[PDB]
Write a protein that binds this ligand. Structure first.
Ligand SMILES: N[C@@H]1[C@@H](O)[C@H](O)[C@@H](COP(=O)(O)O)O[C@@H]1O
Ligand SMILES: N[C@@H]1[C@@H](O)[C@H](O)[C@@H](COP(=O)(O)O)O[C@@H]1O
Ligand SMILES: [Fe+3]
Ligand SMILES: [Fe+3]
Ligand SMILES: [Fe+3]
Ligand SMILES: [Fe+3]
Lengths: 392, 392
């Protein structure tokens, strides 16, 4: 169905239209205007009072949620994340693996390749943009909740095998540069236009600066599983903040880091160099309990997911809720929200021609939210994928 | 002598005049223009080729230099700092005390009061704007090079005595808020328009936020003698960076903190909320050796001043050299330099009506520097106080 969204504040690439209309046809945005379009629309949505139209949010680092985990390596896994992610305003994602035995990683990559290729559920809900390979090529000293017994130095031929198994779907790799001899895998990823994200790394600042020259461009979940900031040895944390060649992922749940630490990331990076993620695992959107994550038991109580030794282990964060917290932490604009939840991700993935802004020609991936970032309605490639309690 | 500076790039409050003239009469700036003034001038200075006219730099945290230390409590002490500070582009300063026996602090404060009052050397060189009382009301856990045996909790009646002894000259106090029961002294300083600078403090973020409400507004030498940044407990370092109610002093020598840490301070604070200082002690501008500082022996080798246990102990930094490093660390503008070396200090001390910008009506405190921040000439309240190797 062609679709028209009526009388809403629209957050475009560069501005906020106070009251506008967006028309959608054959999956794409065909009209963005202050005035009702002439053309007829099959369904029309009358937007609630103080609502805001944002570009659909893009989560580049997310393991699971709603009982599912990428590592499970079934079609059901992705039917579920696909189906349910629109409820937190997410319209596309990178299914994220974890450090694990290489054959477990192979199964997850092949599953995703085949599920996307099936073109069944992969046409509906949040679009599987590909894979974020998180580990195993990380530091034994910054494992966090990555299974320690499966951590191994970078292996370019094994990755090459993984990327063939993935049918080219791997878009980002998280790795520790100091565990990558000669920046071999970093140099390989740069060659292949796969983002090299520095994470779970105990590297010093000098080495990170050299990695950026070899092609590193992202930092994985800023503050988490990183060598700390010392004012005379800034480590991963200080380089991620002060080095303008890195885009920084951030988990804005107010648990992975303090509100002032989230605010510092926004001050230091600016709204064009920061990408909110959930890093969520399978207990997101379920109840208290114990859940598998990377072969370990994670005990979820309240908003905190912990290993038995109290190590934080993924999040329980919904994407829209991250937006709300960042607005509280920094008083940023709706424009900045669109940036740090959608636009920056799209640009970094090289898909800004089709995602990441409310703009004519792009996929009609959109979220209607309240002034408080509650999700009201989500559209995915032109189909309504979620409608909240405010139906009618 | 009335004075005219000819054909120079001038850094005003809000702009850089590419080629201008500044005329000076009876100690004040009387003309700032792109065109040669009509009025006759007794001496005229022809500025060298790529030079820049900056407002004279203001150092709000400096113990000594050139063999002298505030704590020495002689007229010679201030004759020397007064006389010699213009060589690093400094035209006004706060002589800074240290943690020490209360009678040693009394002597330093009375000396300064009497030396300023004498109006002899106090009319020439860098102007003694008053005193920065650094300690003793600091943390035993963040003493750094402050003499540990003299550290004591805040005492409002003893300060009140000190300020009477100082003839009202105390403009800033460095103190640890957690050692100030009920924020009593902080509340007192706010009442008296004396800056309360948080420093040598092991406080957490919550407490610092409450101190700012009680009236705390500065942070003493950002990164040094501070509880570290942890991403979930930001401490003094993270609050100083992310809390917009604090102006942050910074020692830009590339030794007290790493270049990326200096750059982070500039990203997080912006150029209106950061104040370069030297924190220099008596060995500044002398040779390698051992020197007294706060009753301890400081071994100066190269650019590093250390206690016998390797603790950093004041700096050997010249003010203009701090400007040069910050330009290297951040690529900031000449305008930003004027801010972080002069304007912000003046505004914070409540003396922007007379210092801190190249502006008609203000004291003629000015520094001519090269494109690399080498000092060429310094004027103090209208008198030439330093002329380098480029005479003629
Ligand atoms: N998925 C990662 C974990 O692996 C890590 O343990 C956690 C906390 O990291 P940190 O203790 O360094 O802040 O971040 C995320 O939750
Ligand atoms: N005058 C202070 C010292 O008291 C302190 O020891 C030093 C280093 O501080 P830190 O080791 O915390 O960086 O800063 C300045 O030099
Ligand atoms: Fe991780
Ligand atoms: Fe993760
Ligand atoms: Fe100090
Ligand atoms: Fe000091």
């Amino acid at each position: 169905e062609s679709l028209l969204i009526k009388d809403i504040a629209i957050v475009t690439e560069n501005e906020v239209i106070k009251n506008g209309y967006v028309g959608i046809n054959d999956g794409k945005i065909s009209t963005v205007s202050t005035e009702r379009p002439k053309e007829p629309y099959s369904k029309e949505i009358q937007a609630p009072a103080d609502s805001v139209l944002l570009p659909g949010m893009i989560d580049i680092h997310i393991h699971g949620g709603y009982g599912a985990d990428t590592m499970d390596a079934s079609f059901s896994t992705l039917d579920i994340m696909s189906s349910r992610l629109p409820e937190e305003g997410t319209t596309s994602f990178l299914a994220t693996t974890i450090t694990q035995e290489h054959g477990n990683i192979s199964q997850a990559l092949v599953n995703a390749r085949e599920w996307k290729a099936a073109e069944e559920s992969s046409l509906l809900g949040a679009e599987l943009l590909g894979i974020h390979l998180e580990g195993p090529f990380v530091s034994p000293k910054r494992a966090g909740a990555q299974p320690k017994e499966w951590i191994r130095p970078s292996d370019v031929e094994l990755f090459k095998k993984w990327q063939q198994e993935a049918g080219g779907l791997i878009k980002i790799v998280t790795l520790a540069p100091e565990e990558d001899q000669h920046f071999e895998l970093i140099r390989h990823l740069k060659d292949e236009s796969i983002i090299a994200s520095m994470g779970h790394t105990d590297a010093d600042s000098a080495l990170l600066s050299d990695a950026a020259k070899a092609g590193a461009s992202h930092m994985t979940h800023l503050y988490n599983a990183m060598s700390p900031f010392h004012h005379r040895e800034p480590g991963v944390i200080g380089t991620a903040l002060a080095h303008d060649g890195f885009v920084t992922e951030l988990i804005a749940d107010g648990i992975h880091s303090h509100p002032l630490a989230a605010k510092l990331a926004f001050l230091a990076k600016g709204s064009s160099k920061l990408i909110l993620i959930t890093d969520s695992m399978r207990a997101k959107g379920l109840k208290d309990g114990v859940y598998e994550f990377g072969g370990q038991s994670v005990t979820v109580r309240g908003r905190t997911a912990l290993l038995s030794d109290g190590t934080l282990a993924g999040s329980i964060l919904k994407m829209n809720e991250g937006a709300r917290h960042m607005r509280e932490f920094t008083n940023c604009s709706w424009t900045d929200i669109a940036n740090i939840t959608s636009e920056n991700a799209a640009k970094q993935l090289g898909i800004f021609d089709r995602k990441g802004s409310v703009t004519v020609g792009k996929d009609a991936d959109l979220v209607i939210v309240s002034s408080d970032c509650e999700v009201i309605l989500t559209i995915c490639r032109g189909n309504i994928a979620f409608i909240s309690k405010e139906a009618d």
